[PDB]
């Protein structure tokens, strides 16, 4: 339809057949990353003026990298409309910083942008399209869900069709800190793996024994390759 958030919010309030009831035991976690903090703070203050404190909560990082911040947006006991509104605002804002630095409107979504994002949900789901599940997720407890390349109205309709079929329930109390510790542990492991990248040659592989362990073996393999080339030349020769 249009490119406005509130008109699609009125449309999704109208024809979703009494969608005012929220979901019992409902939880969503959106970890996002921003380059700067000052532009994020005005949009988050407007979001807290629009969305209450009990429904949505925010969690900052520990400032370890000092360049790329990591902010958790936890939607707890949310309705289906506020979820669509928050995901539309955040998916517009974390891509407007790269596409439209001169538009300057935190609640007007242009036409050139497509909404593509990734959000976590708890494992206890029951579904019994643009939003897909993932295979081989990195989080032990949570399930990653993908949306890709949509307009505003398609994003609204797809998120509402997704949350109208899924059934949540019985979430753990301090599961947010558990996800924080697990997320920090996993990305500290891959940061340590990137730290192991200059330490390949002569660093920590015990090269002094590894040369002598494979010194006759590569020579015999090279002799087998030379014998293979000579036998192939004898096999392809007519003579």
């Amino acid at each position: 339809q249009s490119f406005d958030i509130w008109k699609n919010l009125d449309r999704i309030r109208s024809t979703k057949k009494n969608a005012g009831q929220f979901i019992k035991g409902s939880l969503l976690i959106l970890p996002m990353r921003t380059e700067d903090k000052q532009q994020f703070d005005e949009c988050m203050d407007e979001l807290h003026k629009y969305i209450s404190k009990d429904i949505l909560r925010c969690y900052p990082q520990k400032e370890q990298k000092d360049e790329g911040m990591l902010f958790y947006i936890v939607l707890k006991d949310f309705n289906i409309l506020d979820s669509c509104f928050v995901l539309s605002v955040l998916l517009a804002f974390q891509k407007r910083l790269w596409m439209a630095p001169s538009e300057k409107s935190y609640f007007r979504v242009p036409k050139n942008i497509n909404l593509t994002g990734s959000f976590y949900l708890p494992k206890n789901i029951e579904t019994g399209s643009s939003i897909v599940e993932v295979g081989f997720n990195v989080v032990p407890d949570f399930q990653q869900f993908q949306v890709k390349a949509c307009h505003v109205s398609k994003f609204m309709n797809e998120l509402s069709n997704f949350f109208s079929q899924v059934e949540f329930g019985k979430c753990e109390a301090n599961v947010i800190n558990y996800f924080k510790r697990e997320y920090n542990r996993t990305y500290s492991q891959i940061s340590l793996a990137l730290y192991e990248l200059p330490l390949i040659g002569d660093g920590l592989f015990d090269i002094k024994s590894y040369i002598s362990k494979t010194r006759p073996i590569i020579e015999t393999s090279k002799a087998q390759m030379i014998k293979h080339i000579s036998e192939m030349k004898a096999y392809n020769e007519i003579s």
Binding site: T214, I217, I218, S221, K222, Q224, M225, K227, H228, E231, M232, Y235
Partner: peptide, 12 residues
């Protein structure tokens, strides 16, 4: 039959 590679071959 075409001749083999004289396997195992660790390096290749």
């Amino acid at each position: 039959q075409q001749p083999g590679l004289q396997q195992p071959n660790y390096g290749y």
